[PDB]
Amino acid sequence: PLHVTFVCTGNICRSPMAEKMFAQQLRHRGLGDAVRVTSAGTGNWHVGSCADERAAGVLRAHGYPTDHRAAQVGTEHLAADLLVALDRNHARLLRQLGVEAARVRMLRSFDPRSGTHALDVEDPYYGDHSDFEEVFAVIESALPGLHDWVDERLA
Ligand SMILES: [Cl-]
Secondary structure, three states: OOOEEEEEEEOOOOHHHHHHHHHHHHOOOOOOOEEEEEEOOOOOOOOEEEHHHHHOOOOOOOHOOOOOOOOOOOOHHHHHOOOOOOHHHHHHHHHOOOOHHHHHHHHHHHOOOOOOOOOOOOOOOOHHHHHHHHHHHHHHHHHHHHHHHHHHHHO
């Protein structure tokens, strides 16, 4: 059972959205039981909390699940086959956490339009609904490449 996890700071906005969106797609693709998808944060001040409301609101609006319980990065996540970081600071930390460079990758690097220098997924925490809608757009735009990665592994 392949294991892919998404990582941001608080695990209440960006990472949780990626997790659910990806999970959903995997389900549509009949790959539900082949891949395990989670998300965790580098910080510990939101641990156990539900996903940010504005985040849930956008997921809901697009028909995605919103059930979520924030977790801090732990042994569980550090053991995933692929750690996907939302921005480059998350990437730096997972790296300092012991994960080898190759198992750590930024979400946008999977965007089919991405260049060599991956882009951060801007944090929408200090904005409103539209900002999360934007983040959804950015994430949706990146996931396809993550699917290519999964397909390859499952083969
Ligand atoms: Cl967050």
